[PDB]
Symmetry: D2
Subunit: 461 residues, 4 copies
C-alpha cells in the first residue's frame, strides 16, 4: 500500500512503463552506467532530492540512481513539463514523486516541499540533483539546517549554474556543486541539438502552423539559440537573430542569419519610439532563448505583427513580459498551453477579433510545455553526466569532512574530460558510429594517450 506520491492519474503507469522500456533502448550511455555500477552500488546510502522535469527521460535517470543504491524523492522543475505517464510509472514503482502537468504556482511549491519533508519532518537527504536552482534556493533559504548533511548539488542547466556561481561569489553557497551543464556531451548536445529537435516539435503540436516561408526572430544565439534557430531554419523559416554578445552574433552571420535588434540601433530607451516597428510588424514568430529578463518586452509585444506566435525556450518565463499581457489584454484559451492574447483590451474579446498574439505554454519552456522536450537519445548524454556527478560528490562525502578540508572543496566544478569522452563514445556507438583508434606513432605525434583525453581543457569543440 504505497501512498507516498502525488500524480495526475496512477492508471497511466502501464503506458509510462512501456515508454520507459523503449527509452532505455534509446539511452545507451545511461543504461551502460546502470549495468556498470549496479554491482558496486556506489550510491548505497545516498538520499537524493531531485528537482527536474518529470519526463520519460527523467524516469530512466531516476531508476538508474535507484538501481545504483540511492533513495530519492522527486518533483518536476516546471509546472508544465511533467509527462503524466512518466510520473505514474515512477510512483507505481514505489518511488516518491510529486508532479503533474499543469500545476499551479502554489502546487509547484508544495511538490518541492513534499520531497524535502517526509512525514512532516525534514528528510535525511544527503544529495541534491537540480535543474534551474529552485530546489537549491529553497534549501538555502528555508531549510539551511538540511544542507549541513548534504554532500553536494549536481546542477543541470545554464540558469541554475549561474545561480550557483552567484552564491559562491557571495559566500552563500553551503555545499559543493558539479556543473553538469558544461560537459560537452551536455551543453553542446542537449542545449543545442535538443532544442533543434524539440522547438519546431512544440510549435507544431501547439498551433499546427506551417513554418516554411514565414519570418522568425530568435532572441539569443548561445547554445539554445543556435539550436532553436536551426530548428526553424531547417523548416524553411526566414530566421533573424538578435544578440548582445558580438561573438555569438558573428557566428549567426557566418551561419547564414541576418542579425537585427528589436530596438533602433540596438538601444532600448524604454519608450515605444525606440522599437523597430517596421521590423517587428513583419515577424510571424518570436522565440526567446537567453536566460535573461524581459527580452521580449511590452513595447515589443505591442508592435508584433497580428497573429504572431510568441514563445520562450529559456528556463524561466520572465524572458517575456507576460505580466503586462495579463494586466492589459484578454486571454482566450485555445486548448491547454495555447492562448490567444487579444490586444483589443482587458474586459472580454470578440471571438472573431483579428488582433491577437498566440502565446505557447504561458511563456514557460515551450519544448517541454507543448511537446515532450528533448528526445531520449539526446538526454542520454545529459543524464549519464548526472549519474557520474552524483557518484563523484557522494563519494567525496563533503558533509563529513573537517572544516579546513571543506573549505578546499567548496567550489563549482565540471566533470573531467576523460569522462565526457567516455559518455560521448557510448553515444556514438548508439548511432552505430565507429571511432578510429590512434596508432602509437600517431598518439605520440599529437601528444595524447591512445586512450585520450584527446584535447586540452581549453578546447572549445
Amino acid at each position: 500500500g504505497f501512498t507516498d506520491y502525488k500524480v495526475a492519474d496512477i492508471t497511466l503507469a502501464a503506458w509510462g512503463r512501456r515508454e520507459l522500456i523503449i527509452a532505455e533502448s534509446e539511452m545507451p550511455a545511461l543504461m551502460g552506467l546502470r549495468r556498470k555500477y549496479a554491482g558496486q552500488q556506489p550510491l548505497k546510502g545516498a538520499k537524493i532530492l531531485g528537482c527536474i522535469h518529470m519526463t520519460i527521460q527523467t524516469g530512466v535517470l531516476i531508476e538508474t540512481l535507484v538501481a545504483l543504491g540511492a533513495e530519492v524523492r522527486w518533483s518536476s522543475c516546471n509546472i508544465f513539463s511533467t509527462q503524466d505517464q512518466a510520473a505514474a510509472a515512477i510512483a507505481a514503482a514505489g518511488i516518491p514523486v510529486f508532479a503533474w502537468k499543469g500545476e499551479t504556482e502554489e502546487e509547484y511549491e508544495w511538490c518541492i516541499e513534499q520531497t524535502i519533508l517526509k512525514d512532516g519532518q525534514p528528510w535525511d537527504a544527503n544529495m541534491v540533483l537540480d535543474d534551474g536552482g529552485d530546489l537549491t534556493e529553497i534549501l538555502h533559504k528555508k531549510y539551511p539546517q538540511m544542507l549541513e548533511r548534504i554532500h553536494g548539488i549536481t546542477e543541470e542547466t545554464t540558469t541554475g549554474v549561474h545561480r550557483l556561481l552567484d552564491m559562491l561569489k557571495n559566500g552563500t553557497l553551503k555545499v559543493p556543486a558539479i556543473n553538469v551543464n558544461d560537459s560537452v556531451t551536455k551543453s553542446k548536445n542537449d542545449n543545442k541539438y535538443g532544442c533543434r529537435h524539440s522547438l519546431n516539435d512544440a510549435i507544431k503540436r501547439g498551433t499546427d502552423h506551417l513554418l516554411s516561408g514565414k519570418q522568425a526572430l530568435v532572441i539569443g544565439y548561445g547554445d539554445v539559440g543556435k539550436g532553436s534557430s536551426q530548428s526553424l531554419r531547417q523548416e524553411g523559416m526566414i530566421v533573424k537573430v538578435a544578440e548582445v554578445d558580438p561573438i555569438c552574433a558573428m557566428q549567426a552571420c557566418m551561419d547564414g542569419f541576418e542579425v537585427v535588434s528589436p530596438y533602433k540601433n540596438g538601444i532600448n530607451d524604454g519608450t515605444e519610439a525606440s522599437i523597430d516597428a517596421a521590423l517587428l510588424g513583419k515577424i510571424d514568430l518570436i522565440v526567446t532563448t537567453t536566460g535573461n529578463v524581459n527580452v521580449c518586452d511590452a513595447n515589443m509585444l505591442k508592435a508584433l505583427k497580428k497573429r504572431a506566435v510568441v514563445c520562450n525556450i529559456g528556463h524561466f518565463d520572465n524572458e517575456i513580459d507576460t505580466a503586462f499581457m495579463r494586466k492589459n489584454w484578454a486571454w482566450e484559451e485555445v486548448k491547454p498551453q495555447v492562448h490567444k492574447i487579444h490586444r483589443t483590451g482587458k474586459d472580454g474579446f470578440d471571438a472573431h477579433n483579428d488582433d491577437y498574439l498566440i502565446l505557447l505554454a504561458e511563456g514557460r519552456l515551450v519544448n517541454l510545455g507543448n511537446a515532450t522536450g528533448h528526445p531520449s537519445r539526446i538526454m542520454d548524454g545529459s543524464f549519464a553526466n548526472q549519474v557520474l556527478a552524483q557518484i563523484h560528490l557522494f563519494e567525496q562525502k563533503y558533509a563529513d569532512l573537517p572544516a579546513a578540508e571543506k573549505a578546499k572543496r567548496l567550489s563549482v566544478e565540471v566533470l573531467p574530460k576523460k569522462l565526457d569522452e567516455e559518455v560521448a563514445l557510448e553515444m556514438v556507438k548508439g548511432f552505430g558510429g565507429v571511432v578510429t583508434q590512434l596508432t602509437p606513432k600517431q598518439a605520440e605525434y599529437i601528444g595524447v594517450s591512445v586512450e585520450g583525453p584527446f584535447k586540452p581543457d581549453t578546447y572549445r569543440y
Copy 2:
C-alpha cells in the same frame, strides 16, 4: 632602386593593388585598426619577421602592420599558397618579400632565410609572426642568437601552436608567444567557416567535378573538419566522417553525418587486411583535416575507388602518404597542382588508364594550393587578432628584461575575451548586423557589464 625582394613577376603589381583595394573594403576590423592606431604608431620600432601564405589577405595584414609603424620582412609558409599578384604588389610598395606560387622545398627554405638575413647578416628583428611554426623552428635551431632580441611570436594556426606548447613543456621556447589561433574570431571563424568557403572552391577549380550525389570521406571533425564536412555536404555530397575523438564524433552524428573508420572496427594494425575495402571502394573524395601524421595511409590509397580525388586541408602534407605514391606509382600532371596517380606501376602509364587517383596540390593545403584560401572578410578576424597580438607583445618588451624576469614572463597566452568581442563586433557591423545593448537591469540580472565581456572564460560558443 628597390631590389630587396624575390617574386614571380613584378609586373603583376597593379593587378594585386586593385585586389588589395577591394580586400580593404572586405576587412573592416583590420582597416578600423589602421584608422584607430595609425596616429599613435604603436609598432614604431617593431621589426617583424613574417611567415604566412603571401595572399591578398596577408597583403592587407602586412600594410596594416607597416601603417602602424613596423618594418617587416616576409615569406610564405607554403610552397603553393602565394598569390603572385599579391607578392608583386607588396614588393612594389618597397616591402621585402620572398614568395611565389610553386616554390621548391629548397627555394622555400631560401625565402625564409632572405627574411632572416639582410645583406648577408642577421637582420635586427624583434618580433615574429608565424603560421605553422617553420620560421619559429629555424630561429630556434639555426639562429638562436637572434631570439635574444625578439620580444615575441604571434602564431596563426593550430599546428603551430602545438609546436610552441611542445617547446614550452621541453624548456626550449626562448620568447613568449600569443596563440592567435584560439581567439573565437579566429578558430571558430577562420578554421571552420574559412574551410567551408574554400574547400569546395579548390576542388572545383582543380577538377571541375560535380560533387552532388557522390561519396566523401572526411578524416577529422575538429574546426577544420567541421567546416570541410559542411563545404561538401552543402554541395549535396554524401559525407562520412572519421574521428579518433569521441566528442567530435558525437558532434558529427548529431550534425547528420555517418561516422566510420577506414579500418575494420577502427583498428589500424598496418596490414592491408585491416582496411575496410568495401567502404573505401565506394569513396569518390577523401579530405584529411587532422594535423596528424599518416591519416590517409598507403593501404587506404590502394583501396580507394578508381578515380577518387585525394586532398589535404591540414597544415602539412604528411597527412597523406604521398611518399608511398612517389615510390610506387606514375604521376601524370593534368595542370599545375593537379596530378593523376596511376596505380598500375612506376615506369610510365597508359594515357587512357582508368586506375588512377587525382591528387590536389601534391597533398599540400588544398584550399590555398588550388584556390585562394579563405576569403578576405573571414581573414579580417584572424588578422585583426594578429595585429592586436603584435602590439601587445611589442609593448611588453620581453627582450629587454633581465634573465630572472624573462623566466616569470615566458608563456603562451591568448588575447583577452574583451578584445575577441571587439573584433567580433566590427565583423558583425561589416555584415550590417545590429547587436542589441543590454539595459542596466538586464546586465545586472545576468551579472555582466553592459559593455562586456558577456561570457566567462570557460564558455565554448
Copy 3:
C-alpha cells in the same frame, strides 16, 4: 439536429476555435468565400464529400456551404479525423460521419450514411473524393445515383489513377476534375505538406531523435521528395529507392544515395534477394509510392531491430502488415503505435528487444499520428477544390443532351490561369510581392501581362 455521428459533440467549441485560426491561415480559400458568397454559385449543389475530416477540411466544407451548397461528409481514412473538427461541423448543422479510430466496417458505414438520407439515396449531384473509395461505391453499389451527378473532383494521385482506369475502360459515368495535378496542389500539398508533417508524425508517435540515424524512403515522387526532405532536414542519413530512373536521378542530385532493398534491384520473392546488410542498418523506413507491397515480408524480417516502419502513401497495402498480423505479436504502446515482436505470434516478452515499431497500423502516417498538412498548405489544395466544384456544377453534365455528355465525359485539370490565381493569393499570405511585367517585357517573352506566364508543357 441529429443527422451526424462523431466521437464527442462536446469538442465542438474547441474545434470552432481552431477553425477560426485556420481561416486566418487560408487566404485563398477565404478569398474565394468572400468573392463568391454574394453570387451563390453552388446554390442547388448537393455534395457527397469523402476526405480526411481535419480542421482544414472543415474550412473547405464551410466554404462550400457559404457558396450555397448542401453537403454530406465522411473521412477517407479510419485514423485521419480530428474529432474536434468533426464535432464543430456537426454542431454547425452539417451532416458528418467521422471519428478517429474507426473500424473498417464503421468506415464503410460512414460513407453509406452520406449516400443515404432517411434510408434512401440522397439527391446528390456532386462528388468530392480523396482516393476514390466514395467514387467506387457509387459506381458499384449505387449506379442509379450517378444519373443525377454533374461531376467528381478528386484530390489525390491514387484517386486520379483509379478515375483514369475507369475512363479507359468506359466505366466512368460522370466527368471529373483531377485536382491533384494543379501545381498549387501536387507541388505544394504532396511535397511540402509531407515535408512538414512526416517528421511531425514520427516525433508525436515515438519521440525518437532522428538526427544521426539511417532512413530508407521508398519512392521519390512528390510525396517521396517531401518525405526525404522532412527526414534529411532533421539530420537523418537518408537513402532513397525508386523504380523510376528520372526520379532516381533527382534523388542523386538532391544529395541522396539511391539503393534498392533487393540485390541488384531484382525482387524475385526469395529471402536471398534481400540486401540484408543494407536493411540491417536502417532505423526508419517510409513508403511513399501508391504501389502495392513495397515494404514486403522479407524486408520486414531483415530490418534492424527496433526500426520504425510507416507509410505516407494513400493506402496501407504499401507495407505487408497482413504478414505481421499473421506471424508476429502486436503490443500497443499507445493509440496508433504498436511494437511488433518478431519472436512469435502468441504472446511476447515485455522486455523483448527484437521488435519493429509500426505507426498508424500502416495507414497514412502524417494524418494517423499527427494532423496531416498545415492549413496554409491545404489552402492551395482546397481553393482548387472549390473552383473545380464550381466549374463542374455550372457545367450541369447530368442535364445535358447525350451528345453533349459524350463530348464532355473526361478527366480534366483546371486551367493554368486559375492555378496562378490560387498561387498569387498564397504568396500574398506570406507577404510576398509578385512583380508585374512591363508591356515590353510581356511582349519579349510572349505572354500577357496578366498571365498565364508559362506554356502548358511547363513542369516548374
Copy 4:
C-alpha cells in the same frame, strides 16, 4: 596540313586532351551512346553545324557525334564561354572549330560564318545543333537556301526554344526541331543543378568574396533561378527572390525564401520613385535568371548598395542594363571578366572611390564567363539528349520530303519519355545508384510496363 580552324593557342591541345579523357569518365550516358551506336554509324552522312559553348564538355559531345559518323563545323554561342584548351584539342583532332575566350562581337559573328562557309561557299550541311538560336537565326535570315538541305535542328536551351516557337507560330521555321531543353534529364538537371554547382563557383573565382551572411537578390525562380537561389543559400547567403509568375513565387516561399519586388507594389513604372530603395540599398549580390529583358534596370543599378556584385546567368546579357552603365559610368578592369563600374561619372575614376559596383563577365553568362559552366557529370544528361535528338531527326530525313509532306512534319517536339528515362538510368548508374525493378504484379497495380515509361506525359517531376 590541317588548317581549317581558329583557336587561341593550338599548343594547349595536350592539356585539353587530358581534361577530355577525365571528362569521358564523368559522362557515362554519353560514352554509353558511343558504344551502343558506334557499330551502326547512325550519323554516317550527317554534316552538323554546331554552335554551343566550346567547353571540355562540348568536346566530348563533338567527339561522340564524330564517333557515330558525323562531320561537324563548330563555334561557340558566347564570346566568353570557350575553354581555350578544349578548342585546341578539338582543332588538333582535325575538326573545324572557330572559338576562343574573349571574342569581340565581330569575331563572334565571323566564327559562326566560318562554320557555315567552307572555302568561301556554303557548306553542304544537313543538320544543326544550337544553343540560344543565334546560328538558327543567321541561317533563316542570311542563308535560307541552306535550310532546303537541312533535316532538323536540335536546340539546347530555353531561350533558343522560345525563338523556335516564335518562328513556328509565324510560319517562318523552315525545318523541324527537337526541344532538347525540355527533357527532364536536361531542364531539371542542367538548368537547375548545373547553376547550383556553377554560380557560386564563378562568383568565387571572380571576386573571392565571402557569401555567407550577405544579402542576395535573385531575379527569377524558374529552373535557373531555383538552382541559382540554392547555389547562394547553401553558402549561407540570405536570399530574396523576385518573380512575375505567382506559381514560381509560391515555390520560392515554400522553399524558404522571402519573395520581394524591386518596385513598390511590384509596379515597374520606370521612375526612381518606384524603386524600393531600402531593399536595393541592402543587397550585396544580384543575379538575373529570367531570359527576359532589362530585369536589372538602370534605376535598380543606381539604388544598389555600394560595392554590390552584379551578374547574369540567363542566356543573353540584356537582362542587365549594361548599356546604361557603359554610357554613364567609368569601368575599371580588375582582371579579365571582372569590372568595377564607378557610379561617380564617365570621365575617369578615383582608384580609391568607394561608390562602385562589380560586374562579372560584362553581363554575359556568368557561370561560363568567370568559371567553366556546368560540370561534366551534369552535362552528360544534356548532351546524351543532344546525340539522341540528332539521330532522331537525321534518321527521319525531312529535307527529302515534298513540300506538302514537310508541312505535316514541321514541328518542335521533345524526345519521348523512354529516351529520357534511359539517359537518367545511365546517370544514376554513374553515381552507383541501384534502381529497383517492379514485379509483374506491381507493374500491373500502377498501370505501367516493367520497362517503363513509368509516368504519364503530363507528369512534372
